Design a protein around this ligand. Sequence first.
Ligand code: MG
Ligand code: MG
Ligand code: MG
Ligand code: MG
Ligand code: MG
Ligand code: MG
Ligand code: MG
Ligand code: MG
Ligand code: MG
Ligand code: MG
Ligand code: MG
Ligand code: MG
Ligand code: MG
Ligand code: MG
Ligand code: MG
Ligand code: MG
Ligand code: MG
Ligand code: MG
Ligand code: MG
Ligand code: MG
Ligand code: MG
Ligand code: MG
Ligand code: MG
Ligand code: MG
Ligand code: MG
Ligand code: MG
Ligand code: MG
Ligand code: MG
Ligand code: MG
Ligand code: MG
Ligand code: MG
Ligand code: MG
Ligand code: MG
Ligand code: MG
Ligand code: MG
Ligand code: MG
Ligand code: MG
Ligand code: MG
Ligand code: MG
Ligand code: MG
Ligand code: MG
Ligand code: MG
Ligand code: MG
Ligand code: MG
Ligand code: MG
Ligand code: MG
Ligand code: MG
Ligand code: MG
Ligand code: MG
Ligand code: MG
Ligand code: MG
Ligand code: MG
Ligand code: MG
Ligand code: MG
Ligand code: MG
Ligand code: MG
Ligand code: MG
Ligand code: MG
Ligand code: MG
Ligand code: MG
Ligand code: MG
Ligand code: MG
Ligand code: MG
Ligand code: MG
Ligand code: MG
Ligand code: MG
Ligand code: MG
Ligand code: MG
Ligand code: MG
Ligand code: MG
Ligand code: MG
Ligand code: MG
Ligand code: MG
Ligand code: MG
Ligand code: MG
Ligand code: MG
Ligand code: MG
Ligand code: MG
Ligand code: MG
Ligand code: MG
Ligand code: MG
Ligand code: MG
Ligand code: MG
Ligand code: MG
Ligand code: MG
Ligand code: MG
Ligand code: MG
Ligand code: MG
Ligand code: MG
Ligand code: MG
Ligand code: MG
Ligand code: MG
Ligand code: MG
Ligand code: MG
Ligand code: MG
Ligand code: MG
Ligand code: MG
Ligand code: MG
Ligand code: MG
Ligand code: MG
Ligand code: MG
Ligand code: MG
Ligand code: MG
Ligand code: MG
Ligand code: MG
Ligand code: MG
Ligand code: MG
Ligand code: MG
Ligand code: MG
Ligand code: MG
Ligand code: MG
Ligand code: MG
Ligand code: MG
Ligand code: MG
Ligand code: MG
Ligand code: MG
Ligand code: MG
Ligand code: MG
Ligand code: MG
Ligand code: MG
Ligand code: MG
Ligand code: MG
Ligand code: MG
Ligand code: MG
Ligand code: MG
Ligand code: MG
Ligand code: MG
Ligand code: MG
Ligand code: MG
Ligand code: MG
Ligand code: MG
Ligand code: MG
Ligand code: MG
Ligand code: MG
Ligand code: MG
Ligand code: MG
Ligand code: MG
Ligand code: MG
Ligand code: MG
Ligand code: MG
Ligand code: MG
Ligand code: MG
Ligand code: MG
Ligand code: MG
Ligand code: MG
Ligand code: MG
Ligand code: MG
Ligand code: MG
Ligand code: MG
Ligand code: MG
Ligand code: MG
Ligand code: MG
Ligand code: MG
Ligand code: MG
Ligand code: MG
Ligand code: MG
Ligand code: MG
Ligand code: MG
Ligand code: MG
Ligand code: MG
Ligand code: MG
Ligand code: MG
Ligand code: MG
Lengths: 275, 48
Amino acid sequence: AVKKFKPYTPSRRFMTVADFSEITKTEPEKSLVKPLKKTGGRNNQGRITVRFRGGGHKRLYRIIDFKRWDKVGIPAKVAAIEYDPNRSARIALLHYVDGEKRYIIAPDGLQVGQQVVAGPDAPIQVGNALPLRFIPVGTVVHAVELEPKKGAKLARAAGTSAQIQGREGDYVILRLPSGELRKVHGECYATVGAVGNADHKNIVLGKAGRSRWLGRRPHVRGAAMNPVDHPHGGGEGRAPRGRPPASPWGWQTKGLKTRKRRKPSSRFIIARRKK
Amino acid sequence: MKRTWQPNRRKRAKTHGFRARMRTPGGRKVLKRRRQKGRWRLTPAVRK
RNA sequence: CGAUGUCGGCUCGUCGCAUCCUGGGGCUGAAGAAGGUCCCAAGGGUUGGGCUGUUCGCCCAUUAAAGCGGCACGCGAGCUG
RNA sequence: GAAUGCCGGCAUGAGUAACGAUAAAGAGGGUGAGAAUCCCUCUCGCCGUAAGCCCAAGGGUUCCUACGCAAUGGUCGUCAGCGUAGGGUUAGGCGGGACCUAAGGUGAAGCCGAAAGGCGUAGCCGAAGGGCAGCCGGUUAAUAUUCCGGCCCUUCCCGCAGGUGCGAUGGGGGGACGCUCUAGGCUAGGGGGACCGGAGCCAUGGACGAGCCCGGCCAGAAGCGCAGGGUGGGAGGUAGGCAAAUCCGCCUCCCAACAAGCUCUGCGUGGUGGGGAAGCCCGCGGGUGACAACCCCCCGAAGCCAGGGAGCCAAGAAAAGCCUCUAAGCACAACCUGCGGGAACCCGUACCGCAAACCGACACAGGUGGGCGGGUGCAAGAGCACUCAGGCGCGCGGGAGAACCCUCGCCAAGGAACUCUGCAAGUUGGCCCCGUAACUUCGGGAGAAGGGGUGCUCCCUGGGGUGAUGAGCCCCGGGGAGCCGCAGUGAACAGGCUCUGGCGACUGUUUACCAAAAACACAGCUCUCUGCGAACUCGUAAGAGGAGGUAUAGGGAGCGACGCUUGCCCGGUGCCGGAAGGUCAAGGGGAGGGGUGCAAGCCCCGAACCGAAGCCCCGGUGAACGGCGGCCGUAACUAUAACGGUCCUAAGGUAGCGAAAUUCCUUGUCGGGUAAGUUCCGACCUGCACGAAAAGCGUAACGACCGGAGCGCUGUCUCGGCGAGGGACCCGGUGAAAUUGAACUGGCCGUGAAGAUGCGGCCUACCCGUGGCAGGACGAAAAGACCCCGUGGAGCUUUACUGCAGCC
RNA sequence: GAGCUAGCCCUGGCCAGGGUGAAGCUGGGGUGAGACCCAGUGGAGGCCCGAACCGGUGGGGGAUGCAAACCCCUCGGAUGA
RNA sequence: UGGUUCGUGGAGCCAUGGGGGAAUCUGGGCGGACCACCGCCUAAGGCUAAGUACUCCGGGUGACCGAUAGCGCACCAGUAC
RNA sequence: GGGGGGAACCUGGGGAACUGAAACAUCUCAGUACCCAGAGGAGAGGAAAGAGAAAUCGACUCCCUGAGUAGCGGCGAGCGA
RNA sequence: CGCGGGGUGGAGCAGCCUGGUAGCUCGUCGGGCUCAUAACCCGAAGGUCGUCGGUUCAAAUCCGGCCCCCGCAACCA
RNA sequence: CCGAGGGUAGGGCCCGUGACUGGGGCGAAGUCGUAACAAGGUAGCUGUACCGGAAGGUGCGGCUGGAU
RNA sequence: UGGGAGAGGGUGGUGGAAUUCCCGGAGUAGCGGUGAAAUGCGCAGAUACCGGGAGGAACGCCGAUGGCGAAGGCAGCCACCUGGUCCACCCGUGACGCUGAGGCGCGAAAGCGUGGGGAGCAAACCGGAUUAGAUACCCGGGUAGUCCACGCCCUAAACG
Ligand SMILES: [Mg+2]
Ligand SMILES: [Mg+2]
Ligand SMILES: [Mg+2]
Ligand SMILES: [Mg+2]
Ligand SMILES: [Mg+2]
Ligand SMILES: [Mg+2]
Ligand SMILES: [Mg+2]
Ligand SMILES: [Mg+2]
Ligand SMILES: [Mg+2]
Ligand SMILES: [Mg+2]
Ligand SMILES: [Mg+2]
Ligand SMILES: [Mg+2]
Ligand SMILES: [Mg+2]
Ligand SMILES: [Mg+2]
Ligand SMILES: [Mg+2]
Ligand SMILES: [Mg+2]
Ligand SMILES: [Mg+2]
Ligand SMILES: [Mg+2]
Ligand SMILES: [Mg+2]
Ligand SMILES: [Mg+2]
Ligand SMILES: [Mg+2]
Ligand SMILES: [Mg+2]
Ligand SMILES: [Mg+2]
Ligand SMILES: [Mg+2]
Ligand SMILES: [Mg+2]
Ligand SMILES: [Mg+2]
Ligand SMILES: [Mg+2]
Ligand SMILES: [Mg+2]
Ligand SMILES: [Mg+2]
Ligand SMILES: [Mg+2]
Ligand SMILES: [Mg+2]
Ligand SMILES: [Mg+2]
Ligand SMILES: [Mg+2]
Ligand SMILES: [Mg+2]
Ligand SMILES: [Mg+2]
Ligand SMILES: [Mg+2]
Ligand SMILES: [Mg+2]
Ligand SMILES: [Mg+2]
Ligand SMILES: [Mg+2]
Ligand SMILES: [Mg+2]
Ligand SMILES: [Mg+2]
Ligand SMILES: [Mg+2]
Ligand SMILES: [Mg+2]
Ligand SMILES: [Mg+2]
Ligand SMILES: [Mg+2]
Ligand SMILES: [Mg+2]
Ligand SMILES: [Mg+2]
Ligand SMILES: [Mg+2]
Ligand SMILES: [Mg+2]
Ligand SMILES: [Mg+2]
Ligand SMILES: [Mg+2]
Ligand SMILES: [Mg+2]
Ligand SMILES: [Mg+2]
Ligand SMILES: [Mg+2]
Ligand SMILES: [Mg+2]
Ligand SMILES: [Mg+2]
Ligand SMILES: [Mg+2]
Ligand SMILES: [Mg+2]
Ligand SMILES: [Mg+2]
Ligand SMILES: [Mg+2]
Ligand SMILES: [Mg+2]
Ligand SMILES: [Mg+2]
Ligand SMILES: [Mg+2]
Ligand SMILES: [Mg+2]
Ligand SMILES: [Mg+2]
Ligand SMILES: [Mg+2]
Ligand SMILES: [Mg+2]
Ligand SMILES: [Mg+2]
Ligand SMILES: [Mg+2]
Ligand SMILES: [Mg+2]
Ligand SMILES: [Mg+2]
Ligand SMILES: [Mg+2]
Ligand SMILES: [Mg+2]
Ligand SMILES: [Mg+2]
Ligand SMILES: [Mg+2]
Ligand SMILES: [Mg+2]
Ligand SMILES: [Mg+2]
Ligand SMILES: [Mg+2]
Ligand SMILES: [Mg+2]
Ligand SMILES: [Mg+2]
Ligand SMILES: [Mg+2]
Ligand SMILES: [Mg+2]
Ligand SMILES: [Mg+2]
Ligand SMILES: [Mg+2]
Ligand SMILES: [Mg+2]
Ligand SMILES: [Mg+2]
Ligand SMILES: [Mg+2]
Ligand SMILES: [Mg+2]
Ligand SMILES: [Mg+2]
Ligand SMILES: [Mg+2]
Ligand SMILES: [Mg+2]
Ligand SMILES: [Mg+2]
Ligand SMILES: [Mg+2]
Ligand SMILES: [Mg+2]
Ligand SMILES: [Mg+2]
Ligand SMILES: [Mg+2]
Ligand SMILES: [Mg+2]
Ligand SMILES: [Mg+2]
Ligand SMILES: [Mg+2]
Ligand SMILES: [Mg+2]
Ligand SMILES: [Mg+2]
Ligand SMILES: [Mg+2]
Ligand SMILES: [Mg+2]
Ligand SMILES: [Mg+2]
Ligand SMILES: [Mg+2]
Ligand SMILES: [Mg+2]
Ligand SMILES: [Mg+2]
Ligand SMILES: [Mg+2]
Ligand SMILES: [Mg+2]
Ligand SMILES: [Mg+2]
Ligand SMILES: [Mg+2]
Ligand SMILES: [Mg+2]
Ligand SMILES: [Mg+2]
Ligand SMILES: [Mg+2]
Ligand SMILES: [Mg+2]
Ligand SMILES: [Mg+2]
Ligand SMILES: [Mg+2]
Ligand SMILES: [Mg+2]
Ligand SMILES: [Mg+2]
Ligand SMILES: [Mg+2]
Ligand SMILES: [Mg+2]
Ligand SMILES: [Mg+2]
Ligand SMILES: [Mg+2]
Ligand SMILES: [Mg+2]
Ligand SMILES: [Mg+2]
Ligand SMILES: [Mg+2]
Ligand SMILES: [Mg+2]
Ligand SMILES: [Mg+2]
Ligand SMILES: [Mg+2]
Ligand SMILES: [Mg+2]
Ligand SMILES: [Mg+2]
Ligand SMILES: [Mg+2]
Ligand SMILES: [Mg+2]
Ligand SMILES: [Mg+2]
Ligand SMILES: [Mg+2]
Ligand SMILES: [Mg+2]
Ligand SMILES: [Mg+2]
Ligand SMILES: [Mg+2]
Ligand SMILES: [Mg+2]
Ligand SMILES: [Mg+2]
Ligand SMILES: [Mg+2]
Ligand SMILES: [Mg+2]
Ligand SMILES: [Mg+2]
Ligand SMILES: [Mg+2]
Ligand SMILES: [Mg+2]
Ligand SMILES: [Mg+2]
Ligand SMILES: [Mg+2]
Ligand SMILES: [Mg+2]
Ligand SMILES: [Mg+2]
Ligand SMILES: [Mg+2]
Ligand SMILES: [Mg+2]
Ligand SMILES: [Mg+2]
Ligand SMILES: [Mg+2]
Ligand SMILES: [Mg+2]
Ligand SMILES: [Mg+2]
Ligand SMILES: [Mg+2]
Ligand SMILES: [Mg+2]
Ligand SMILES: [Mg+2]
Ligand SMILES: [Mg+2]
Ligand SMILES: [Mg+2]
Ligand SMILES: [Mg+2]
Ligand SMILES: [Mg+2]
Ligand SMILES: [Mg+2]
């Protein structure tokens, strides 16, 4: 809940950081980190494949329980709430009572000291993890598996939320944060409550420099180029686009849908996203 | 001003050198050409 | 066209006379002073700025007058751009 | 005989330009056939965060010595980084390896690919990172943390004595980490000393003095003190750490804590071992001083204790070594402690190393990572002035003292009149104090602007550190009287200022090598795509990136902080939605027709109908591609038109701006500034041809961006003048190049392919140099880049043609 | 062929000295409790002056140069993209 | 689709990436779409020297060259650079 | 037993374009140049499921003829049994 | 200087391209409605189709030359 | 030392003035349409926002000073 | 002290009618709209009916000239937190009372800022009518906004 700055440089006129009220613990747990190999776009061929990434701050990757059905019925203590670079969310350290320690992501309203536990028998209180068919209709849920025992894919970003709008058969209907209505299988676990850090969208990055700290290089417009590089480029003067505005590589970028038409996942979606 | 040759005993022996060349059917042809040629020095003389 | 470097300005001149001033003369609707026009005459002189790349031009303050032209729209193996 | 022909040789230019830093040279002696140039000595100059020392790259005999000068040396050369020959590089501890892993590379499994090959989990390789035991002095012509002396230490093997469930390629701990600021105590390094050591000196007026000058340290096991770091202890249960666990983790009980104990490191003393100047006696080093002294005080780190503390978001490597835990296995073994004895391998080690030894063809004013980098006054400082050790005077000199060039200094009187512009060059310049406007995002503007002080002597007074409360030293002030000069940041390193307009908000980035900007980028806004094996991209594939991310996220596109805002048109293109319909390929279907045979039979065309994308068709869609009107009349002065009429369109430019970065006619008209203003600013609006995300109108602060104006000060100017040294000129030495049909190469007027030294006719004109100036020789250089030509060539575009990847 | 240049990945290093004084903490004030104000502390910033370092703004030299991009005076950044 | 001269042409033969998909001498393919006759030959497994090509090597011979010619090199060459 | 060389010669698996067509896309350069694999002193091919019209030849290779014939071609250039 | 559209009743447009025939609205004129005006209803007139020239049976029409009137291009130097 | 006044420099208030511009008041009869007075031909007034050539129109909310 | 009714405020949950949208059934030629017509919607199967799901805004009858508050204003039900006012008893204090320049707080609706939400309604806008003209009264689409959270704006026929 966001921290502003007095304008003592021009970049600090706008620049906001997150408060870090809710952090509890300032260096992460040593048994559970392993180094993020930075890429900068570069594949194994070493060409850039997506552009304009590079130059980040160095980072350590935190291993997360995205399953929670490892440890069914075995309850756990919320040890701490930590920073993680790699997510919009924050993270929760779980002290399980057999003393395996694990990270999970950090739902809103969760506080240190209280007790979470995963399974079909689990109570409906924030941060417990259940298969979807054992969760009531109408509730707000996160960290949602998509096919069962493949580990959690849906609603992992900050402040995000899925609503169970109901059941059909083996399958159960979610309102995703897009507002896609999509059948999920019931046996896919999910994890109750919505994700913390919900003022992540209200950061203003101030200046050029924070994007370089986050590893996002300058993005350079296609009408600033010359037409070998890009369709838009060149033209004496400035150019309006002159053509249906478009990628580098040819295809348009006002309105062309490119979801695959023959996808077998199409038989499980009710409603497209909106807005 | 900083001209183009900034020499390096490692980089020379790793790039132009022998166990570069026999790895690659580029370079296996190259020494094949030079041994066909007559040449005294197949790889560059690198100085260990 | 196996190159004839282009406008303007600066510096350096020189030439023609259909003459801006100055010299001489005729006519004048020339009283005098000052003017108009025409003839002879190139000895020498013909300022400093404001504006703009300026050639030209407009204006300011003077003058006796603030001339028209050529010389690869004189002049970059002298300069400037 | 020619081909800007090909190779070779020699001319011209020409004894010309230059001789590679305006840091600088003079003399005496020596050696020599020969000396401005080699050696020595004295005087003189230069760097002195370097132009001085130690590394790392790279170079690979250049290091040292003896014998030399043909050539390399921009001159000479007895000299050298040059020729010949010989010597020269020593390591258990420095660095690398027999230890580790990161990016990456290779890669048994396994996946993919016509071939070649491409991915790829484990593992290996990969270092200037982690781990790891050496400090001080001496010696040689050359090597030394390497040989020697002193004092310390590590691994392995063996042998003893004792102690313990020993045991790893496995589990756990630890190694283990950011940025900025910072505390305490040290040391490095430096300063002073009226105290200690000493060879010496009274010079020229004075000085025998608490006089001058020099020096007053290094290292050092055990132990000890100081300053730190690291660190909770027992019992029980326990499903987790992929077998086991006495270890770790989790839960419970108990114990004391700005502790303490255990352990580790830095610093000091520390048995002891070493060093030891100035000078002057010999000759690039050696003896004495001296038996050296080896004390105290002050400053003090970025370095150490170190993994210290505090704050902040962008959240800050892996493995091994080290400790512990157990399984197979052994439990005569195997480890742990202490000692003793033995064993200890390979590479480099010379030398330059901001340079004449490396990269620039060169002994080239260029480029090159890390460490030390002293002193003094400058507020501080790695800045600038002058210097210590140490190293150089840049490998052509001597002369004169022209024009003219580079670089520097000065000026009357005026102060931008020069001029595309104050281009350039001046004034101001540091610190402290007073004081500082509109405007605005409240931070700013702003060091705004504009002034006042700044040296030296004496006296009095305050605070802080070290101490001991003291002295002394160091730092930081306040007040009063007085002295000198033109001047007191007395030399050197230091902003000229304002007003106002255009553009971009800003800090940044860019055409290495002509453009640093208004261009790019930027946080910010919006549109669109994307439900995870995501969309997208690279690859035929495998597989990667995306991303070990999951719509507050990822791709694409366009504006581009912010304030106020972003209107109308779906007619055509685009994209999105639409099971009807029309058009539509292979295929299904087989009405009929044909060929052949005597025949069953074989074979060939083949209509109605069925039949997908795509298109046609029906809607939506502008922060999608785009577009946003003519003509005529009308108001009780004229003038204009708030009205009306009519035609087309899919719709006719709203706000806000406007002769503007856009305004052809045009220096539009009016006003301001100026004596005068094709510029600038404020307005008008008849916008050839602004205008709303190729965004519109503004906007404080910022800008080496671009116009305009003013103050201040000037050699920019009327308008030049003088002086300085580096060339230029003269002499001695060495000595090129572009170019060159050949030459004995004058002007005027003609003339000729038009602009003649050569043809014609006149005029002028003895032969040959040197310093200069540049009109010509249509001067040189480059087979015109503007233009055209060739059915030349190459990027780029598209509703050109045809095809291909891709997608449907 | 990435030993130049461009970008990224892994790993170390470098940035003298001075200036402004944000958050926060502590105290005082304030109200019923808050906001908020003041003082001290505190040292944040794509902050300011300004060397090494990275650049290359304007002007003069240089033009068969010292150099196939130099030198001089002048200037921008210099805890960050 | 490729090979044959065969560029779809009346397009057969030989090879075959896709789909359908039998029979054993009364059994199959061919004789240039196809039908008939009349003939040729026996696929879907492999082996086989001689004649043919070349000339880093050795010898023989040139109406081949004779140091800018002849191989790039007649010589310490694929070296110096 | 294989790996790896060998100036060419050979076979297979891939396979351009300048160019000719006086432009150029079918064509042509041409299955040439090159890349890769793989034989051996040779490689390839090889005993007819063939030729083609005489009821004829009798495995393959190589030279001469056939023959620039038959033919193939934006029936162009040219290709060529 | 060049190229290509237009001129028709008083105003704005339509009619041409394949010749004949001059249409629409507003205006104007006469009457009605109203107390009266405008609007509303009924009816009406008004045309060398810019010009000279032919062509052809015949020209607003088709083709040259001129007159206005509209706009456009005037580029590498 | 103080010091009348002069000079330089930056602020504050006030007056005149200024091309052009926004609006107002006034001015017997000009032009355009009719919102308010009746239920004013759509009840009106009002705060605010948007639009319009003009009164004014609509939205949202309130009042009756609105009749029937 | 005891008792009393009330849409008093705030927070969190919850029920139901209806509109609109989506899914399915069944069914045909017009629905809708007006003063009358048209735009539109509809054979691509509309309207009307039935069932199911999602979605938001407002709480019909009770309900009135009534209740509550200082004002603005407050209306389904449930709770929790909480304020003003009233009656009886006449227990306790002992004039502590009143208004109130400033100040500070609240303050309808439209508007503004960041993020949600958006079923209906609806300025601007587009169309169709009406009219000489109609930027409007009528009709069909239809964005902000109307709702929630926080922060601003602080006006009114805030009136009795
Ligand atoms: Mg780790
Ligand atoms: Mg890789
Ligand atoms: Mg690779
Ligand atoms: Mg986080
Ligand atoms: Mg460009
Ligand atoms: Mg490219
Ligand atoms: Mg490219
Ligand atoms: Mg393109
Ligand atoms: Mg374009
Ligand atoms: Mg360009
Ligand atoms: Mg343009
Ligand atoms: Mg050899
Ligand atoms: Mg050899
Ligand atoms: Mg020539
Ligand atoms: Mg005369
Ligand atoms: Mg005269
Ligand atoms: Mg006269
Ligand atoms: Mg007279
Ligand atoms: Mg001229
Ligand atoms: Mg001329
Ligand atoms: Mg000229
Ligand atoms: Mg010139
Ligand atoms: Mg010339
Ligand atoms: Mg000339
Ligand atoms: Mg120019
Ligand atoms: Mg030449
Ligand atoms: Mg000469
Ligand atoms: Mg000379
Ligand atoms: Mg000379
Ligand atoms: Mg010199
Ligand atoms: Mg002698
Ligand atoms: Mg010096
Ligand atoms: Mg060398
Ligand atoms: Mg040698
Ligand atoms: Mg030597
Ligand atoms: Mg010599
Ligand atoms: Mg000799
Ligand atoms: Mg010599
Ligand atoms: Mg000698
Ligand atoms: Mg030698
Ligand atoms: Mg060994
Ligand atoms: Mg590989
Ligand atoms: Mg390893
Ligand atoms: Mg190492
Ligand atoms: Mg190391
Ligand atoms: Mg070591
Ligand atoms: Mg004396
Ligand atoms: Mg001392
Ligand atoms: Mg010691
Ligand atoms: Mg276990
Ligand atoms: Mg000790
Ligand atoms: Mg000594
Ligand atoms: Mg720390
Ligand atoms: Mg390992
Ligand atoms: Mg043990
Ligand atoms: Mg021993
Ligand atoms: Mg050594
Ligand atoms: Mg050495
Ligand atoms: Mg250095
Ligand atoms: Mg050199
Ligand atoms: Mg030299
Ligand atoms: Mg050098
Ligand atoms: Mg550099
Ligand atoms: Mg450097
Ligand atoms: Mg110093
Ligand atoms: Mg001083
Ligand atoms: Mg210095
Ligand atoms: Mg020299
Ligand atoms: Mg002067
Ligand atoms: Mg003077
Ligand atoms: Mg002046
Ligand atoms: Mg002038
Ligand atoms: Mg200047
Ligand atoms: Mg000042
Ligand atoms: Mg003095
Ligand atoms: Mg001290
Ligand atoms: Mg200075
Ligand atoms: Mg301008
Ligand atoms: Mg900028
Ligand atoms: Mg450039
Ligand atoms: Mg270029
Ligand atoms: Mg710049
Ligand atoms: Mg530049
Ligand atoms: Mg914005
Ligand atoms: Mg993947
Ligand atoms: Mg990843
Ligand atoms: Mg832009
Ligand atoms: Mg503003
Ligand atoms: Mg459209
Ligand atoms: Mg459209
Ligand atoms: Mg359409
Ligand atoms: Mg039908
Ligand atoms: Mg068919
Ligand atoms: Mg179809
Ligand atoms: Mg728009
Ligand atoms: Mg409009
Ligand atoms: Mg204008
Ligand atoms: Mg314009
Ligand atoms: Mg736009
Ligand atoms: Mg813009
Ligand atoms: Mg503007
Ligand atoms: Mg501005
Ligand atoms: Mg700038
Ligand atoms: Mg900048
Ligand atoms: Mg000289
Ligand atoms: Mg002569
Ligand atoms: Mg002559
Ligand atoms: Mg002659
Ligand atoms: Mg001479
Ligand atoms: Mg000349
Ligand atoms: Mg000259
Ligand atoms: Mg020439
Ligand atoms: Mg030519
Ligand atoms: Mg060019
Ligand atoms: Mg042609
Ligand atoms: Mg052509
Ligand atoms: Mg062509
Ligand atoms: Mg690189
Ligand atoms: Mg590089
Ligand atoms: Mg700071
Ligand atoms: Mg800065
Ligand atoms: Mg700076
Ligand atoms: Mg600076
Ligand atoms: Mg340094
Ligand atoms: Mg640069
Ligand atoms: Mg420069
Ligand atoms: Mg110059
Ligand atoms: Mg600077
Ligand atoms: Mg074929
Ligand atoms: Mg097949
Ligand atoms: Mg067959
Ligand atoms: Mg057949
Ligand atoms: Mg046959
Ligand atoms: Mg000869
Ligand atoms: Mg030869
Ligand atoms: Mg082989
Ligand atoms: Mg082949
Ligand atoms: Mg051709
Ligand atoms: Mg062919
Ligand atoms: Mg064979
Ligand atoms: Mg047989
Ligand atoms: Mg052929
Ligand atoms: Mg062929
Ligand atoms: Mg041109
Ligand atoms: Mg051109
Ligand atoms: Mg052109
Ligand atoms: Mg006074
Ligand atoms: Mg006074
Ligand atoms: Mg009315
Ligand atoms: Mg009304
Ligand atoms: Mg309205
Ligand atoms: Mg009210
Ligand atoms: Mg009611
Ligand atoms: Mg009582
Ligand atoms: Mg409201
Ligand atoms: Mg608004
Ligand atoms: Mg509606
Ligand atoms: Mg309308
Ligand atoms: Mg109308
Ligand atoms: Mg709607
Ligand atoms: Mg709005
Ligand atoms: Mg809005
Ligand atoms: Mg309010």
